[PDB]
């Protein structure tokens, strides 16, 4: 499956200036567009190479949309202040996530249209794309508002139509980047702990997309240990990184194996240094 | 102005460390709220000039993440680290770069 997601953040800073507003567009796990009110002039700028193929009217319409949404979020911050009986001297945040995951075919798998106030869930469009789910009473006021006005219909119209079509277009244009599959380069490192045990470390570098599984099978299989495992992090060049470490007594190094399961690999890797 | 998530820091590099070969050092800071944060990259305890930052965005649970990166030429005697300041921590956390972790 593939995804087109948009992440929007409005943060207030009383005494300084107007609220800072940012928009970030993602295809799958790769950022490709950005908006920021704290720039030389606020415009929708490209962040990937394949997206620069778009014409000037593309960026013009996206900039207009971002500025409209920024005004909306300013008003929203003030009304949330009124809603929660909060002082005008504090810094508050308003996050918004909207997007579509479609299957390999093209049918819409899932639509997202959710908001959060101060890092807490506010209101979210359900899976039916018709009804809303609110957290507290202010969000219930917002929900009854949006149900009178019927905003769910317009939001579902975006999620089922515009979003899917533009995701198909983005995949088609950036074929060379988005749908590539890079195999992980993996290796095992060794460290002597201050005691008699040693730390074995299984790496996986330079893979794309980020979906990978790193596991440690012992003499046979199973985990059965507090294996260390960091989250998949980005190397900053389009590829990703992961590693899993384990402790092992001095001598059993030849009895431990690492398994790398990645979609860009014909056969999962079995490893041991 | 509500909850507090303490940032998580990872310092690493793209390509495996090779002495004399220039590379990119990354500071990956995830799972923090509020989004106001300060990240500095230090070489031998001194601040590195040109430090570039990925655009701030959040994850499914509304926790913000960000990626700082700079050019660096790793040697065997140079020390690299990442210092973070955030409203959830009493003091600026420093995570040193381990060429094996």
């Amino acid at each position: 499956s593939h995804s087109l997601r948009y992440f929007v953040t409005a943060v207030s800073r009383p005494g300084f200036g107007e609220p800072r507003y940012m928009e970030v567009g993602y295809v799958d796990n790769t950022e490709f567009v950005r908006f920021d009110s704290d720039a030389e002039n606020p415009r929708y700028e490209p962040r990937a190479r394949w997206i620069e193929q778009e014409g000037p009217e593309y960026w013009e319409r996206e900039t207009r949309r971002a500025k409209g949404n920024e005004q909306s979020f300013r008003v929203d911050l003030r009304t949330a202040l009124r809603y929660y009986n909060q002082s005008a001297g504090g810094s508050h945040t308003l996050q918004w996530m909207a997007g579509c995951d479609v299957e390999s075919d093209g049918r819409l798998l899932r639509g997202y249209w959710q908001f959060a106030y101060d890092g807490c869930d506010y209101i979210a469009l359900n899976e039916d794309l018709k009804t809303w789910t609110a957290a507290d009473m202010a969000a219930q006021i917002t929900r009854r508002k949006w149900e009178q006005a019927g905003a769910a219909e317009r939001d579902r119209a975006y999620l089922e139509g515009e979003c899917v079509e533009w995701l198909r277009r983005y995949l088609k244009n950036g074929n060379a980047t988005l749908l590539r599959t890079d195999p992980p380069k993996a290796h095992v490192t060794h460290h002597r702990r201050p005691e008699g045990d040693v730390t074995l470390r299984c790496w996986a570098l330079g893979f794309y997309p980020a979906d990978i599984t790193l596991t440690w099978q012992l003499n046979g299989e199973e985990l059965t240990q507090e294996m260390e495992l960091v989250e998949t992090r980005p190397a900053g060049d389009g590829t990703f990184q992961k590693w899993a470490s384990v402790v092992v007594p001095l001598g059993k190094e030849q009895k431990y194996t690492c398994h790398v399961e990645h979609e860009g690999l014909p056969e999962p890797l079995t490893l041991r240094w | 102005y509500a909850i507090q998530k303490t940032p998580q820091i990872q310092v690493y590099s793209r390509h495996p460390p090779e002495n004399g070969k220039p590379n990119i050092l990354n500071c990956y800071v995830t799972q923090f709220h509020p989004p106001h944060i300060e990240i500095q990259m230090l070489k031998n305890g001194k601040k590195i000039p040109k430090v570039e930052m990925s655009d701030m965005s959040f994850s499914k649970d509304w926790s913000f993440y960000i990626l700082a990166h700079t050019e660096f030429t790793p040697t065997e005697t140079d020390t690299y680290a990442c210092r973070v300041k955030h409203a959830s921590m009493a003091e600026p956390k420093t995570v040193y770069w381990d060429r094996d972790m």
């Epitope: 810094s91 | 102005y1 507090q4 944060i37 300060e38 601040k47 955030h86 409203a87 009493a90 600026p92």
Partner: antibody
Framework: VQLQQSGPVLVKPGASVKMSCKAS????????MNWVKQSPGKSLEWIGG????????SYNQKFKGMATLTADKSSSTAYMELNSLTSEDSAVYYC??????????????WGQGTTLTVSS | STTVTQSPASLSVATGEKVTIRCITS??????MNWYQQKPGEPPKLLIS???TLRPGVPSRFSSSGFGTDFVFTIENTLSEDFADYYC?????????FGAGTKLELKR
């Protein structure tokens, strides 16, 4: 908006004392709480701080072992406890609020201060 | 501890001229330097926060400058109510350290 400290205290040497600091006019957990000493002449030294959100504590090495910082979220009150008190501890003690949200450590609001006298 | 030296310890100026207070640090603190004013009897009041940010409500005659190790606090055309004690405080790393202060008195 308001930080009300306890009244002046007089204790004997080698004893302990607990000062309070009642906060009002803001969400208590959204700000750190520091304590600062001011001596007759040589003035203004940071003792330590606490986070009422998770109890996270920072201390000055000069006063490590002497100061115990706690905070109660229900009554939105900070407490500092001094022990093994000498004459060089007689001073004015302020609870000060640390700026919130931004990644900074300066203080913005100061309590009225409590005068502590250690004398036999 | 990073030491913080404030100069001068005392100053004598009339009503309406410039007051310049220097504050040096022992390490690099970037611009994380803050300026507090304290009138007799009262607790200190924050005047200028990190960087050179003038706090809300503070009159525009107060200003700060400097960066790294050297910092300056300037009052242009001091009023009669500007005469008090002034302290500088770095907020770069722990422990937070204050200056020795400046006893600014009215030269009448």
């Amino acid at each position: 908006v308001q930080l009300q400290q306890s009244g002046p205290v007089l204790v004997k040497p080698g004893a302990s004392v607990k000062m309070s600091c009642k906060a009002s006019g803001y969400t208590f957990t959204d700000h750190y709480m520091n304590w600062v000493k001011q001596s007759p002449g040589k003035s203004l030294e940071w003792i330590g701080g606490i986070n009422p959100y998770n109890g996270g504590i920072s201390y000055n090495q000069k006063f490590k072992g002497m100061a115990t910082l706690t905070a109660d979220k229900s009554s939105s009150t900070a407490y500092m406890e001094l022990n093994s008190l000498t004459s060089e501890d007689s001073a004015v003690y302020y609870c000060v609020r640390r700026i919130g949200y931004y990644p900074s450590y300066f203080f913005d609001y100061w309590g009225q201060g409590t005068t502590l006298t250690v004398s036999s | 501890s990073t030491t913080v030296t404030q100069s001068p310890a005392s100053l004598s100026v009339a009503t309406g001229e410039k007051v310049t207070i220097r504050c040096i640090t022992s390490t690099d603190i970037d611009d994380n330097m803050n300026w507090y004013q304290q009138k007799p009897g009262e607790p200190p009041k924050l005047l200028i926060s990190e960087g050179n940010t003038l706090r809300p409500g503070v009159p525009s005659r107060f200003s700060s400058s400097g960066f790294g190790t050297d910092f300056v606090f300037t009052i242009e055309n001091t009023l009669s109510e500007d005469f008090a004690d002034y302290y500088c405080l770095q907020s770069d790393d722990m422990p937070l350290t204050f200056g020795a202060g400046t006893k600014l008195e009215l030269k009448r």
